[model samples]
Target: MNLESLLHWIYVAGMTIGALHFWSLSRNPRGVPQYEYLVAMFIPIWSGLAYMAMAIDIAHYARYIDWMVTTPLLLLSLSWTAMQFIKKDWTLIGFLMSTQIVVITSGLIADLSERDWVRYLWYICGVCAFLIILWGIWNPLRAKTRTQSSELANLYDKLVTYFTVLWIGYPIVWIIGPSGFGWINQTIDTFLFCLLPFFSKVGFSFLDLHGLRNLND
Candidate 1:
């Protein structure tokens, strides 16, 4: 099989595996929060179907639609982790996710823009919104979580590192891919997106749940 085909199938299968793994883990696991575990499981199911949708039709909009759905699921999962042992605050997660929606839509509008000026303006807007997520939400959430559980604090640090790295790659990859400057071919573009989220959604959550298992709650 060709590389793109390989990446595509592997991407689909990987998402399915993550969905199933999280589902099984969610059911019989000790100390894993039910809502959080279900959210983690639901993530890959949607992505699996979305990527599968992309496979059946070579359409690109579903990719954006995929992000529109799943990225917030990630944010929700992160928020739960931050408030795991504490009284949860909905607005904090709400605000962060609201900013996150801007980041995604800004890119969507940017990519779909007809005029050169419009595209760059929206693209810049997306970048700024992403900075809000980075500088504002992720960091503050990490800080809040750190003082509570030193055990979870270690996970928070590692989580922030990976989250920052992988999430940053989204805009960069989008800018460089055919969606923007065309620095990368479709295969590599798909490959990077595939690999990045494979870690972010599947790998990160697996490690996250592992860390949460340490919690006596």
Candidate 2:
């Protein structure tokens, strides 16, 4: 296989392993809620299959479709993490989910547009919607950790920053890569997409669970 195909295989393997590991952990799940554990587990499973689809190069929009499914789930998991210290809020989670739906939809619109103006317009709209998400995490989510244990509080802080930075990378790549422009080629675009989701979904789960393990005891 060529490097591009090899990279897709690596992503597939990574997500598959992550799903297995999370599944094993879910069997015990210590302090983690069943829904949270399930979300964590499903993110990798869904994405692994999505990458497999991409590797076969059959679908034109599998990557965007992956985000549409997994991104809201990712936000749900994060919102749950932030609310771990308090009562859960479906309303809040739903709000967060809606904004991200806008983000992903706008991005897809942008990518699919033939006119440069339409592309930039939708991309900017997506970025605007993302700002609402940033406000949610930075303000409400970050502040909620204050009443939690020091370790968890610290993890929340780290996640907020890590999440923010990693999230920005998506837009950057979207704008510069094949989706928005020709600054980057298909190979690099595929690689960046693989790397970002790898960390944002799988890596974030490991880090969040590491801190939440205290609840497991």
Candidate 3:
């Protein structure tokens, strides 16, 4: 198949994997709480719609709008995840959610603007927000994760590290993708987006499932 078609399928596959995992996780009697179940359900729908927009070329805003919704849910899940280890730290959760908003919104602003400097400026701001998330929020949470039982803590470590490491690529992709320097074409960009989410989100669900199983046992 052609490059665009390949990327479109890849996106669909990623979303399917993620959606199915969430569905499966929700059914687990010992699974995550109802709030997370809600998050689990909502993410795949909006995420599917987001990639659908890209696959169909619905509009530029379609991707951004999806990000605006899914990104927060993604981070909120992570936040709730960390809280599960300890007390529910809404302060940390709030920071994480707000920074996520900054990250996606700034990038969207960058993409929408025509000026190069303006784009770079917003990109820089987004990256800064991400750094705080990685450093300020995640690192401390990781330290706390260590206090849990070894298996649970290790799983948390893996989940948090997986997303933080993979998330670092988003801004880089933004810089190189069609939105910025144009180093990669639209097909490659869409493919990368899908591929990364598949690994990060669906892959994360697998880890979370295993972790929950451990907790149940």
Candidate 4:
């Protein structure tokens, strides 16, 4: 199959798999918190809808909207999953959520701006927000998490690393893909964009579930 077609199917399947997996969790929600359960429901449904929308129009704004809603929830899920045993103030979580808003809003502005310099300005702002999150939230939290439970610490560590590794590619693609240096064409960029989230978001969700199961055991 062609790249576009391949990505289209990936979204289709990702939606289906993600939704079904979460649905099963709903059937037996013994340990799951309400927020986490809602997030579980949100990911697949939102992901599927966003991908389906993009499949129709590659530049659809719906995907950004999807990210705006889902990204914070994704972090919340990770926080609750890993830190349930430990008690910490919500300061870091609040900062992380606010930073995510800046990141997504700046990115949307960057994409929608007509002026080249304006686009780069917004992109840089978004990157700076991301840096703040990494430095302010994840770093301190990782240290604190390690002191509580090594296993949970390991899980949190892996989740953050995986998220950061995959998420860093977004900016790389931003530079080289569209509206920037144009090292790669749109089709290839779209393919990478679609493929990255599948591994990052969906894959992370599975890992979070596994880690929670282990923690329970």
Candidate 5:
């Protein structure tokens, strides 16, 4: 096999093994910490999203704008995931129901229309809204701790927060910068967006939400 394929296989194997190890720890009858749950769940979920998004790299990287039409399902799922931590699972379910229907209906119409501007605007709004929600996820923690849940959550939050900063550059350039201008800016943005999912999973690998809580509180 080629070097690229070999590398891919190695990476996949490593991730799979790591994910399984965590999952096994989670399933132990003794009961694992909340942080473990976050890690086990976040690892596979973020990795899967990254792979899917990367599969359509160009449009996703460039923020093709209209690509939001294809994003409802992804967003909807992510929304539900976020809700799982902040609220009831039923709230997550309700969120999925309404958003999924709207997304599917809108996506179908966007598909039929020759003018795709509608979808771009829709995507822009959706992205902005999602970012706003992400901003709130960390609001529960205003203070820092030298050791405990606060530290772990803060670390996870910092990683995710920094990631948002990185992604922020992509859309900013795409929306405001001159078309076909700022190659450096565009390249940086695209790189960050593409790497987002990977970095998110990496954060999950070591984040200890339960431990953080114990350490801080």
Candidate 6:
């Protein structure tokens, strides 16, 4: 089959998975906090847009244009909102914000071809994300388990893990895959890359864990 057709099927599957995720979220209500709504909403939108910019070759307009414009802005907002979700005060926020800023800023400025830099920064974000998840984890496991919000932290933790998997996995394959494999490399890379959209929606649906009914109660 042709590459376009391969991508078409992948897109179809991602959309199907995303739809089911949306339906599932509706069934399980997690009063998506306002800040979470804003940050979460934009990350996917901008991620898609950034991909479009590359898929369409809009990078000609700027250098790592996608990363340059997207990283700082997205992470800056994410750090704040995520801190709130975890209920960390400013003392914790300072460390979180600084790490996010340094990683995103330095990586965005480093050449995009320097996959090492980008990956390093992305890993930092993942670490920060994991740290934030600790707070959510407590909400579910510690104290009286509130059904409505019990597992949201664990859910968020899973989302970040899957997403980081997809993100890191794509580049690893793309960079290391054989050069002369022709259609073979494309087929492999595309298949792996296509899983991203699916993971994105799955990540979003974790919000469903946010109800008032305790899972154990």
lDDT of each: 0.82, 0.84, 0.73, 0.75, 0.41, 0.42
- Which has the higher lDDT value, candidate number 1 or candidate number 4? 1
Write the residue-wise lDDT of candidate 5 on 59-129 in tens digits.
Answer: 33312332332233333333333332343345544443444345334433433345548746554554555
Model 4, range 1-217, lDDT digits (tens) per residue? 6667568767868877876886787677656555666676678688778777667552647768878877777766766765667774577777777788889899989998998899999999999998876775477667667667777787888888887788788778878987578899988887887778777677777777756666676
Query: What are the clashing pairs of model 1?
Result: none
- Expressed as tens digits, the lDDT of each residue in 21-78 for candidate 1 is 8888878778776898889988888887887776755236778888898888898888
Point out the higher-scoring one by lDDT: 1 or 3.
1
Go through the candidates in order and give the clash count of each.
Answer: 0, 0, 0, 0, 6, 7
- Looking at candidate 2, what is the lDDT of residue 37? 84
Badly placed stretches (over 4 Å) of model 5 are: 1-14, 24-31, 34-116, 140-163, 166-194, 209-217
Reference-based lDDT, residue 150, model 3: 78
Mark the 10 consecutive residues where model 1 has the least summed lDDT. 52-61
**TM-score ranking, high to low:** 2, 1, 4, 3, 6, 5
Cα displacement (Å) at residue 67, model 4: 1.2
- Better TM-score candidate (1, 5): 1
> Which pairs of residues have clashing backbones in candidate 3?
none
Q: Each model's TM-score, in the order given? A: 0.93, 0.93, 0.86, 0.88, 0.45, 0.46
Q: Write the per-residue lDDT of candidate 3 for residues 154-205, one digit (tens) a residue.
A: 6677788777787887777778888888899877887787777666666665
Candidate 5: residue pairs that collide? 147-215, 148-212, 148-215, 148-216, 149-212, 149-213
Model 1 scores a TM of: 0.93
How well does candidate 4 score on lDDT at residue 61?
A: 70
Ranking by lDDT: 2, 1, 4, 3, 6, 5
Say which prediction, candidate 2 or candidate 5, comes out ahead on lDDT: 2
For the record, the alpha-carbon RMSD of candidate 1 to the native fold, in angstroms, is 1.9
Which lDDT value does model 2 have at 106?
Answer: 95
Per-residue lDDT of model 2, residues 8-122, tens digit only: 8899999988888888878877888788889999998888888888787612488788889898898888888887868887887899899999999998888888898998999
Global CA lDDT computed for model 3: 0.73
